[PDB]
Design a protein around this ligand. Structure first.
Ligand SMILES: O=C(O)c1cc(O)c(O)c(O)c1
Ligand SMILES: [Fe+3]
Ligand SMILES: [Fe+3]
Lengths: 407, 405
């Protein structure tokens, strides 16, 4: 129901690709006030805010890729699956966060089942215990910051500001953290690969808290030379900061600089809003539900919302692969062999095996994978439609005007 | 820079299937084509350089990562496999240059996007196009595909679509090169293709929606997702793409054409709008908006050894980045080490790009168009560490560079 505090933090895989020495030991002295903070707060969920580094987000690269999944494994980065356990996500808040962001005219993406890169699991292994599982659940906000144009900082900030109200409006009884993992100043590409600027580094750290609203004019240029090209990924801080309350109590403000990348921490504490906001919680939970309000009156109709997508993922994903000429070769030639290898539940295997079109719709299969399945089996859309209507094809064709078939 | 007009058409796979099975001749299907014919001819008469082309992918190229406004920035686009193999249609050229500039302007107008290359276009794009353009060995124009996530709710309010379109018009007019741009919105009208309600139509509503959209579009801007789905079937709610398109056209338009046919499940509809234009003068000027865009990368040229990753860059390096990207697939990277040559010969990579990989040529790759994180992968694959590549970026040696702090 409300947010408690939030941490900024470098995400360099130097933390990963080595640790899991006394040059490092009084830098974990920076990682202590965060690690301590995440055990004597006990967070239900962390709205994690990182950038994928061309690992899971390449060919399709978006600005705000909201993870909505059940859970997240580590991404193979060519250097191997990093030996860590899946961390659980929160579909139920993610759905709610999305609805509010949408009504406030923001533009999102939804993903699931894609591994996490160094932008996440590297500094997130060092800030949490990972024994046989993970302390808590995550809500990952992947940010497109490597392909320009990217959202303006003014924009990034407001997204936080919208998130602020959005999470605060989630009716359920929970306390939520925010991870805005970015930076700090550096550049890892080209001839000028090396530049740092700790005097910008310092002024930045300070200005984030004490006067953030004035940063909202910093062009991509204004963080390019100032703090290296990649170092500009700091816009992910302005959003974390955005959500967190106007005023904050900087429970720790560390900084060193070992290798390639400046490494810094900025844990704050949430207080509360600097005023009761121009729109109530009642006014924002109801509105977030405006576009689909009363859609449950509309019969024989199974809207594809985030909750349905999560339920339908394994099976949606499974029939998705009918696009692949091999997978669809195996699907016709050796379904059982194929299922035996899948991660589908027995009911999921049954729905497919029995060819229960209406069931899959009841279950959460979006029509469009049923479409491909039909095609693969050398059978048309009409068949699937008639099945939906408990009719025989010729009976359904009675309802049409013309009697065409196609796939 | 000249927006000639915009058209609206259904994108049912039944169109494609009628085109492919040459039912052009067939009494059921014949009149439906006579219906496309006036749009076809205008397209052939006006000869637009680029069609900015709005459509929804049908859980094909967008499934696991599903954005709302997915601009297509690529060199060219092919037909997606939809379970039965790619259609017989050559690729269609895109417009990277235009895509970039549009991207700049919408970004400034506080719209969040997505950029993509390489993936197939499904019946959303190719069903209608294959009947409106001659494709008997190229396509007469170029496309800027905009894929809209209208399938997985929450999706943007109908108003955001119109607003995207308005912002798009100026984004296109403000394009400072002299080309003819048509605009396309695809999908609907009434149809529902799922659940027990499937087979639902409403001609009365289709004919209303079409006329409002042509004559009083702002009337439709408060219509909710529940409203549109009750009226035109759940999937007919995709018509929010007709707004977007209509948004980008002159406030008043001249409707040259309309047709309607309901043979099966989908109201197969067509609209052709002649852009009137700046009958009213631009609320904000070309120069000032053009400036509001390039703005964020203002003066960024004057930073040395810094090759930033703009759309034009991602386009240039796509083949090599995609190739390097694939290092995360284990079967591939274990072949990169044992059988590098066999892999290059399998790949569509150029002979330049190839040599750049062989030569473990760190800085020319950054130069060419590769983003670092592709190399950061690549390095870790051959057992070489990160800090080496930085040494080579500086033209220095392993220990020589390690000096700073
Ligand atoms: O069954 C149909 O006519 C149909 C199928 C689709 O997959 C679709 O996107 C559409 O607009 C219509
Ligand atoms: Fe990063
Ligand atoms: Fe569609």
């Amino acid at each position: 129901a409300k947010i408690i505090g939030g941490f900024a933090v470098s995400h360099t895989p130097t933390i990963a690709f080595a640790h899991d020495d006394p040059v490092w030991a009084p830098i974990f002295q920076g990682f202590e006030p965060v690690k301590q903070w995440l055990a004597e707060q006990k967070p239900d969920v962390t709205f994690y805010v990182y950038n994928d580094h061309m690992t899971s987000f390449f060919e399709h690269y978006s600005h705000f890729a909201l993870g909505v999944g059940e859970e997240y494994s580590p991404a193979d980065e060519g250097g191997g699956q990093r030996d860590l356990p899946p961390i659980k996500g929160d579909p139920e808040l993610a759905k709610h966060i999305a609805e509010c962001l949408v009504a406030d005219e923001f533009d999102l993406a939804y993903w699931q089942g894609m591994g996490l890169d160094h932008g996440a699991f590297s500094p997130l292994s060092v800030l949490l215990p990972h024994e046989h599982g993970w302390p808590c659940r995550i809500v990952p906000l992947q940010c497109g910051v490597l392909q320009h144009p990217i959202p303006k900082a003014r924009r990034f900030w407001n997204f936080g500001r919208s998130l602020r109200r959005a999470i605060q409006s989630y009716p359920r009884d929970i306390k939520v953290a925010i991870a805005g993992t970015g930076g700090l100043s550096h550049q890892v590409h080209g001839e000028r690969a090396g530049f740092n600027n700790t005097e910008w580094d310092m002024e930045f750290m300070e200005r984030l808290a004490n006067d953030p609203e004035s940063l909202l004019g910093a062009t991509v240029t204004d963080l390019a030379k100032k703090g290296g090209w990649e170092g500009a990924e700091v816009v992910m801080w302005l959003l974390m900061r955005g959500a967190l309350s106007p005023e904050v109590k900087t429970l720790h403000q560390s900084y060193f600089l070992p290798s390639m990348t400046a490494i810094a921490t900025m844990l704050f504490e949430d207080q509360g809003d600097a005023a009761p906001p121009a729109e109530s919680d009642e006014a924002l939970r109801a509105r977030a539900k405006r576009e689909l309000a009363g859609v449950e009156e509309i019969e024989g109709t199974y809207p594809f919302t985030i909750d349905r997508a999560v339920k339908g993922f394994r099976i949606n994903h499974f029939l998705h692969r009918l696009i692949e000429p091999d997978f669809r070769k195996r699907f016709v030639e050796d379904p059982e062999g194929l299922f035996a290898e899948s991660d589908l539940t027995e009911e999921e295997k049954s729905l497919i095996r029995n060819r229960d079109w209406i069931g899959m719709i009841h279950y959460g299969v979006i029509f469009f994978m049923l479409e491909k399945m039909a095609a693969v089996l050398g059978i048309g859309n009409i068949d699937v439609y008639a099945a939906f209507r408990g009719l025989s094809v010729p009976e359904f064709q009675k309802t049409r005007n013309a009697a065409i078939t196609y796939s």
